[PDB]
Amino acid sequence: HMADPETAAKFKSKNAFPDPLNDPKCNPKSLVKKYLTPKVFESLKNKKTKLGITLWDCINSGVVNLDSGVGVYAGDEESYTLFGPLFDAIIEDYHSPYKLATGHNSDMNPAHVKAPDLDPANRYIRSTRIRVARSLKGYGLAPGVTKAHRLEIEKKVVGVLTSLTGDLAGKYYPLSGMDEKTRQQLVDDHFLFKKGDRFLEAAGINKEWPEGRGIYHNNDKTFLVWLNEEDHLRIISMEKGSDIGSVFSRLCRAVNEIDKKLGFQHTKKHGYLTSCPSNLGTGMRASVHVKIPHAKEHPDFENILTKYHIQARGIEDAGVYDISNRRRLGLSEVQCVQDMYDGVKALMELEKEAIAKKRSVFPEVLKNPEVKSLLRKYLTPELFDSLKDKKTAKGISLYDCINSGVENLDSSCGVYAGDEECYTLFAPLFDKIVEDYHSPYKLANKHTSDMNPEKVDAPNLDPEGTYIRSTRIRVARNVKGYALTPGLTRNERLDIERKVVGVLSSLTGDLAGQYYPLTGMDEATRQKLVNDHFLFKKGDRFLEAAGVNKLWPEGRGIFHNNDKTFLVWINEEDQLRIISMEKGSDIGSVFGRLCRAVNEIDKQLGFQHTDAHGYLSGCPTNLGTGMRASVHVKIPKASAHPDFQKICDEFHIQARGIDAGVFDISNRRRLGLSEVQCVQDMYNGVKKLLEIEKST
């Protein structure tokens, strides 16, 4: 249960049977204990491979580490035959029901896999990963490879890897000579490996550490190679989402190229040769993270697992399971992936059946009297019945839209739109909620957008900042051509991030700045952002239930200008949250800067917009202008003045408190007035508040 190398060495130096295998501490499930019998030991203790590999070399880790599951490593290919009486038994046990006599067939042609993307909307599956172990022709395996040959392997591999093009293009980092900065980065990406543990140590695998070891990854960070760790190659293809077809394609592309140029250790009986016999055959571990708490309780759950030879283990994450293959010998890589795909699909269809069933009925929780959401107010059972089966082109149902209000009974609204079509297809519900929250606006009135700052007449109110401390204007926007945030697929969100960053990086003048993706953000970048109050985090339970938090934090990021007067959040609650900000009183300048930035983005990308709703948002509260204009101002005199109420009411502004009696003055309306009108209203209102605070 800890390594005892000193005790093993006594027996090894005498070439005697390892007595500690008969030690009560030893794992009674140890394969080396089970099959290294005194007679097996006697028969094989004097044999050596061409590389000088002995039986003791092979069994050493299993004696040093008595808690071992397997407990042997092969120093070379010859070890599997010369020490066959040991390895054969171990293999056929671990890999049962596989029989070496049956033989193994490899298949790394991704075109043999039929895998249409299971879950692009990411309703169930969270991530997909495929890993294979390989060793190069012409060398011993990792426990027996010579110092010179490990270096030759690294060199040959790197030559192929750095030749890779397209999405496989990337960079190699040798462990030897790696600086602290790089080490930190690779840890942050979880790409780093360190000196092997007690098991690899005792196997002889750690020799010459860290010479000849290295890490390669593509620029997308969806392809990773560990070089000369436990095997010559550990090759991993991975990404968020469900697209195992694309993951396996990328894997195959790289592996076949290496195979072509270099060649792999491989036999009919064993498949690909690896250091540990657990990794023979396909040498593959395929893994999908999927949320299936309902399918788990189904009586056909274990039957599906058994049928496809997969296993389900536990991994915010309730109901999430790691589905993985149990088998590597007797099925091809193609077959493993297809079983993985078919198996997860069957498990997913179970979850979907359970959910469609529960969604087939009016949400009983809404019947409760003390629930006061607009959802409850307007969602009658007849309305529910007339709409519950209709779906948008992007696959959004009514229940998708109302889910957050059903899961969060204490919501105010409780309805999110997954896409533009929701506002039309589920209009009998959405119209009522829009006109309630945005009262007195009527959708029949329609909305006029206006982002021309020259139509605002705003001579600077308080140049000294005596009363007005800061001025802020934010707009929410969503990019035309996509779902809204709650309905986004993985690829849409990534496309949005890519195109927005593109526009933002092209911004010149006082709008020039830098982007900070959340994915792979370091401690110091974060801290810096927190200090400026620029950082955002994963959405709350309302956003979580609305489907807004999917694949967090992929596709999410932060941009700000050098002056820190311009800030953009990407794919937070809306696809775009755009903020212009200043100390002092100059609303015209803040709005002028905002318009310059928003209009440029509009021209390049386009926004989601209708005549009736103005700019579209997943949250109906952010429709129209999607604007929040904010002025921080010290107004003790006028807050007590009796024209105060009249002023706030005429100009549709409201004051809330916050260093002094600084009040936040913000706009009350978003639909029925243009951005220009909103800013002009704010200017006019604040002007009158100032005239009272300044009278003598």
CATH of the domain at 485: 3.30.590.10
70 is in an annotated binding site: yes
Find the helix or strand (DSSP H, E) in which 667 lies: strand 662-667
Q: How distant is the alpha carbon of residue 432 from its chain centre?
A: 36
276 is in an annotated binding site: yes
**CA distance to 227, 503, 598, 654, 666, per residue, from 452 (Å):** 58, 20, 11, 24, 20
Contact 627, 599 (CB under 8 A): no
Contact 253, 167 (CB under 8 A): no
List strand residue ranges (DSSP E) for 283-381, in order: 284-291, 310-314, 320-325
Please tell me what DSSP assigns to residue 233: E
Contact 430, 544 (CB under 8 A): no
Q: What are phi and psi of 24, to 5 degrees?
A: -50, -30
Which 3 state secondary structure label does DSSP give 138?
coil
Say if residue 89 is in the same domain as residue 130. no
Q: For every residue of 29-76, which 3-state class applies, written as one string?
A: CCHHHHHCCHHHHHHHCCCCCCCCCCHHHHHHHHHHCCCCCCCCCCCC
The total of structural domains in the chain comes to 4
CA–CA dist 372, 391 (Å, integer): 27
Sheet holding 233-240, edge to edge: 170-174, 214-218, 223-227, 233-240, 125-134, 284-291, 320-325, 310-314
CA–CA dist 646, 650 (Å, integer): 6
Say if residue 129 is in the same domain as residue 6. no
Q: Which of 573, 585, 582, 677 is nearest to 625 (CA)?
A: 677
Q: Which of 345, 325, 344 is nearest to 336 (CA)?
A: 325
Contact 37, 95 (CB under 8 A): no
Contact 271, 283 (CB under 8 A): yes
Helices (H), 579-658: 587-605, 636-640, 644-650
CA–CA dist 57, 79 (Å, integer): 10
Please tell me what DSSP assigns to residue 476: E
Say if residue 583 is in the same domain as residue 627. yes
Say if residue 547 is in the same domain as residue 428. no
123 is in an annotated binding site: no
Q: Which of 178, 146, 173 is nearest to 162 (CA)?
A: 173
Enclosing domain of residue 133: 104-360
CA–CA dist 234, 227 (Å, integer): 7
Contact 63, 32 (CB under 8 A): yes
Q: Taking the CB of residue 355, how many other CB atoms lie within 10 A of it? A: 14
Say if residue 332 is in the same domain as residue 197. yes
Q: What are phi and psi of 410, to 5 degrees?
A: -90, 15
**CA distance to 468, 499, 682, per residue, from 495 (Å):** 40, 6, 36
- Find tokens 């066959």 and name the residue: 84
Q: How distant is the alpha carbon of residue 666 from its chain centre?
A: 36
Contact 630, 679 (CB under 8 A): no
Query: Any residues with CB less than 8 A from the CB of 361 and at least 6 apart, and which?
Result: none
Domain C-terminal end among 446, 461, 478:
446
Q: Is the peptide bond before 174 cis (omega within 30 degrees of 0)?
A: no
496 is in an annotated binding site: no
Interstrand relation of 557-561 and 513-517 (parallel, antiparallel or unpaired): antiparallel
CA–CA dist 99, 84 (Å, integer): 14
285 is in an annotated binding site: yes
Q: What are phi and psi of 591, to 5 degrees?
A: -70, -35
CA–CA dist 185, 643 (Å, integer): 59
Query: Any residues with CB less than 8 A from the CB of 226 and at least 6 apart, and which?
Result: 193, 213, 214, 215, 233, 234, 236
Domain C-terminal end among 446, 472, 505:
446
598 is in an annotated binding site: no
**CA distance to 475, 567, 594, per residue, from 532 (Å):** 19, 11, 19
List strand residue ranges (DSSP E) for 496-599, in order: 513-517, 557-561, 566-570, 576-583
Q: What are phi and psi of 299, to 5 degrees?
A: -75, -5
632 is in an annotated binding site: no
- Find tokens 């040991």 and name the residue: 86
Query: Any residues with CB less than 8 A from the CB of 78 and at least 6 apart, and which?
Result: 49, 50, 51, 53
Amino acid at 437: Y
CA–CA dist 416, 401 (Å, integer): 5
Please tell me what DSSP assigns to residue 487: G
Q: What are phi and psi of 674, to 5 degrees?
A: -80, 170
Tokens of 45: 């203790």
Tokens of 478: 């969503």
Which 3 state secondary structure label does DSSP give 634?
strand
Say if residue 328 is in the same domain as residue 380. no
Say if residue 356 is in the same domain as residue 252. yes
Say if residue 283 is in the same domain as residue 330. yes
CA–CA dist 538, 67 (Å, integer): 41
Domain C-terminal end among 423, 446, 469:
446
CA–CA dist 153, 212 (Å, integer): 8
Say if residue 184 is in the same domain as residue 264. yes
CA–CA dist 127, 290 (Å, integer): 7
For the chain, give the number of residues: 696
129 is in an annotated binding site: yes
Contact 473, 627 (CB under 8 A): yes
CA–CA dist 137, 152 (Å, integer): 12
Q: How distant is the alpha carbon of residue 418 from its chain centre?
A: 20
List strand residue ranges (DSSP E) for 443-524, in order: 468-477, 513-517
Tokens of 373: 């959401």
Which residues sit opposite 570 in a β-bridge? 557, 576
CA–CA dist 655, 665 (Å, integer): 4
127 is in an annotated binding site: yes
Task: Sort 203 into a burial class: Cβ within 10 Å, 0-12 / 13-18 / 19+.
Answer: buried
Say if residue 463 is in the same domain as residue 423. no
CA–CA dist 166, 475 (Å, integer): 37
Q: Taking the CB of residue 562, how many other CB atoms lie within 10 A of it? A: 11
- Find tokens 């979907």 and name the residue: 352
Sheet holding 566-570, edge to edge: 513-517, 557-561, 566-570, 576-583, 468-477, 627-634, 662-667, 653-657
Q: Which of 176, 247, 256 is nearest to 209 (CA)?
A: 176
Q: What are phi and psi of 215, to 5 degrees?
A: -130, 130
334 is in an annotated binding site: no
CA–CA dist 88, 369 (Å, integer): 70
Amino acid at 291: K
Breaks (C-N over 2.5 A) in the chain follow: 315, 658
Tokens of 108: 């790394």
Q: What angle separates helix 55-64 from helix 5-12, to the nearest 10 degrees?
A: 150
CA–CA dist 687, 316 (Å, integer): 48
Structure-determination approach:
X-ray
Q: Is the dihedral of CA 379, 385, 386, 389 positive or negative?
A: positive
Say if residue 207 is in the same domain as residue 240. yes
CA dihedral 409, 412, 417, 420 (to 10 degrees): 160
**CA distance to 126, 256, 288, per residue, from 334 (Å):** 22, 13, 16
Q: Which long-range contacts (CB under 8 A, 24 or more apart) does 187-195 make?
A: 188/520, 188/522, 189/217, 189/221, 189/520, 191/215, 191/217, 191/221, 191/224, 193/226, 193/229
Query: Any residues with CB less than 8 A from the CB of 371 and at least 6 apart, and which?
Result: 365, 409
CA–CA dist 408, 414 (Å, integer): 8
Q: Is the dihedral of CA 191, 196, 198, 202 positive or negative?
A: positive
Contact 682, 468 (CB under 8 A): no
CA–CA dist 309, 342 (Å, integer): 11
288 is in an annotated binding site: yes
* Resolution value, angstrom units: 2.0
Query: Residue 422 is part of a domain; what is its CATH number?
Result: 1.10.135.10
Query: Any residues with CB less than 8 A from the CB of 313 and at least 6 apart, and which?
Result: 321, 322, 324
Say if residue 480 is in the same domain as residue 340. no
Instruction: Report helix, strand and coil shares of the chain as percent, to nearest 5.
Output: 40, 15, 40
CA–CA dist 150, 207 (Å, integer): 10
Q: What are phi and psi of 133, to 5 degrees?
A: -105, 140
Which 3 state secondary structure label does DSSP give 388?
coil
Convert 412-423 to b/e letters by CB count within 10 Å (16 or more is b): ebbbbbbbbbbb
Find the helix or strand (DSSP H, E) in which 529 lies: helix 523-531
CA–CA dist 7, 202 (Å, integer): 12
